[PDB]
Design a protein around this ligand. Structure first.
Ligand SMILES: Cc1ncc(COP(=O)(O)O)c(CNOCC[C@H](N)C(=O)O)c1O
Ligand SMILES: Cc1ncc(COP(=O)(O)O)c(CNOCC[C@H](N)C(=O)O)c1O
Lengths: 402, 402
């Protein structure tokens, strides 16, 4: 089937909840993706930061192939031999007492909201169902009825029935607004992204995370750091939060936790918070299955062994310096950390972010516009300087061809 | 590590949201599971109906091993070659216009709630945020803040902050209550399980589903059938709903959709409902990835080719007839359809469902008590009559040994 047959078939048998860049991939390895016509491409999206270790990384693939012959799912009704191994590894790696395994990113978020609320009632002493959770405008943590309830983006909540009560929204990168919001003794937690990904890679001012930690601690409020897209070497550290050396009360992980081979997410925190949930009070069918645990352990090792954090840090700096050379009347802004970057295209009476991506595609590079005029540049953390240089050249020639 | 080391390790590094039957499995094939001491067991839980095709079914395993070398995740920002193939297959198999791919079961539910609400406003004409969705008491469709909001089980909602508005709860297996509830013109849908699984396999009276369909159609309300645990041959048909020949407006699938090798769920419905959601109004990172689609196609073929529906129907009848021979002062009730059955143990001043399961385990069979005194008996649909007979004998000797 041609790319056109592929596009047409999905349009007929699948929901129209997406409008993808017209490219039909069928194979991918490392930083490259090949479509059905054999055309090769640089991947500058990494599946929203899920394939940080590059597509089909051999070590993770081996772990999957190995475990599938033994066991894949027993459910948590019975114990399996792998889960506890994974748990000990990840908790010690991130330095938290326990981990609660889930599958998708939203589930990690929902679980965090449930931990905060339960903790608020059983430990903080908030009266039943009066607990609040504060969010920062621009946030994105999923597509569930609750996740869209804290959203400020009309496209995610508009027309989606009544919303979840108890969610307060304050401006992002604003300590005064946080302190003001934390005056209410019924607030159990504050959930924030160290860098807002889907918003368009909006980076907060230095000192912000440190202030959030201080403010939360001062008001006996839980600091929930959503590291589902910024964590795992993407920004240049194990956790974006590490840049300010802060320790959140709850950390959320997902996406790259499996290298893109299996839906695996996790929420980490100490006993005083984790143990508020008793047996039978929360779960998931596939959450914590043997197969997902093997790929997770493998995916974490790849990040550590191949020192992808420092590679991400160095190259990100090169990438940004090069992007900043583009003409201001084209690229109005360049921002990011590590390999999580974005540029703001000055949308005009001619071009826009979509068109740049269409031509970028035509020149061998894949990317996607976040909010109409923003273009994210996030290649797998296994990319090499020379390869980065070649792609930078593709970005330059495309940008300067309009 | 011994089973005891395994138990101990999880207790230290993992959340205590579960209290599993003390058994540490490490390998499973077909209807069997082997623990770390080499002890063999009959699996009568099937991971909550996720491994209907038996553990590590060769055909599904092959599909996974094959696709992993090619592509695993591109995100829906770009097209991949597999998704459309899966979509055409599943939509035609179940006879619906389109399918919206998700990962976990709760996600399928959340997506269904969003479809109903969006349809209610944009098509039915309900005023913004006045749309309601009716649920039946005893229902279970997940662990998200919204899923627990429609729950009547204290263990899932107690202490979990304020709840989602717009959810009405009526008694299960009650047509008069449904009609009464559907008098409110703001009701967009009714979500029901053809047989309530986690409740304890509670089967509604014959004619119920037919009445639900008639009532919903009469009030221009969407009939959402949650077939995440009852569907895919488990009850003796492709869908439990098939027993009354009814066609729901939206069908939810999950668990066995992948044979236990990958988290894959789906929601099926016609264009008039599906197309209410526009591009960018709903999504998921891993939802619809190439890898999950390959295992799904394979998992569906196994069910069809090996005629697991009829096998489930025949053997279920044998299983129930045999269970009904047990003494009334021990087993107060036996119920189910196909291989989705349960017995009610008369809890006394001596024994309870947990103890029966402990001894059942000691005799070579694994099962789990749903609500303190109910024991579910759900073995993989690949089980053979002789094997079923051997397990029935284990059930008898254990039951009659108290
Ligand atoms: C009928 C039904 N619908 C939806 C779901 C939710 O599926 P998940 O994949 O778990 O999101 C289920 C739930 N099956 O319950 C098993 C219990 C689970 N381990 C729990 O603890 O959450 C069902 O049955
Ligand atoms: C920061 C962050 N937190 C949570 C999640 C949600 O993860 P899911 O695995 O998607 O459940 C994300 C993900 N947002 O990117 C996914 C976009 C997707 N196309 C959508 O429509 O849901 C992030 O970034």
């Amino acid at each position: 089937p041609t790319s056109d047959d592929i596009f047409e078939r999905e349009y007929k048998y699948g929901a129209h909840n997406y409008h993808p860049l017209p490219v039909a991939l069928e194979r991918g390895k490392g930083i490259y993706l090949w479509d059905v016509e054999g055309r090769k491409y640089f991947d500058f999206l990494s599946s929203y930061s899920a394939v940080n270790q590059g597509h089909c990384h051999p070590k993770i693939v081996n772990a999957l192939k190995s475990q599938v012959d033994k066991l894949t799912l027993t459910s948590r009704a019975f114990y399996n031999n792998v889960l506890g191994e994974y748990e000990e590894y990840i908790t010690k790696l991130f330095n938290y007492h326990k981990v609660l395994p889930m599958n998708t990113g939203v589930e990690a978020g929902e679980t965090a909201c449930k931990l905060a609320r339960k903790w608020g009632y059983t430990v903080k002493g908030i009266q039943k169902y009066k607990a609040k959770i504060v969010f920062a405008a621009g946030n994105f943590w999923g597509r569930t009825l609750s996740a869209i309830s804290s959203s400020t983006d009309p496209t995610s909540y508009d027309g989606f029935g009544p919303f979840m009560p108890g969610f307060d929204i304050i401006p992002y990168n604003d300590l005064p607004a946080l302190e003001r919001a934390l005056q209410d003794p019924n607030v159990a937690a504050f959930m924030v992204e160290p860098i807002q990904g889907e918003a368009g890679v909006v980076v907060p001012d230095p000192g912000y995370l440190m202030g959030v930690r201080e403010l939360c601690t001062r008001h006996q409020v839980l600091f929930i750091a959503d590291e589902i897209q910024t964590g795992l070497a993407r920004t240049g550290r194990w956790l974006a939060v590490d840049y300010e050396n802060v320790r959140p009360d709850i950390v959320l992980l997902g996406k790259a936790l499996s290298g893109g081979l299996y839906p695996v997410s996790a929420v980490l925190c100490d006993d005083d918070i984790m143990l508020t949930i008793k047996p039978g009070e929360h779960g998931s069918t596939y959450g914590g299955n043997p197969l997902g645990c093997r790929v997770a352990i493998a995916a974490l090792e790849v990040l550590e062994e191949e020192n992808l954090a420092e590679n991400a840090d160095k190259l990100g700096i090169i990438l940004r310096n090069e992007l900043m050379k583009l003409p201001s009347d084209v690229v109005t802004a360049v921002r990011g950390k590590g390999l999580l970057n974005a540029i703001v295209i000055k949308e005009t009476k001619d071009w826009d972010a979509w068109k740049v991506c269409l031509r970028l595609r035509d020149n061998g590079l894949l990317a996607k516009p976040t909010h109409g005029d923003i273009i994210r540049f996030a290649p797998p953390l296994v990319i090499k300087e020379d390869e980065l240089r070649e792609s930078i050249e593709i970005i330059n020639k495309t940008i300067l061809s309009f």
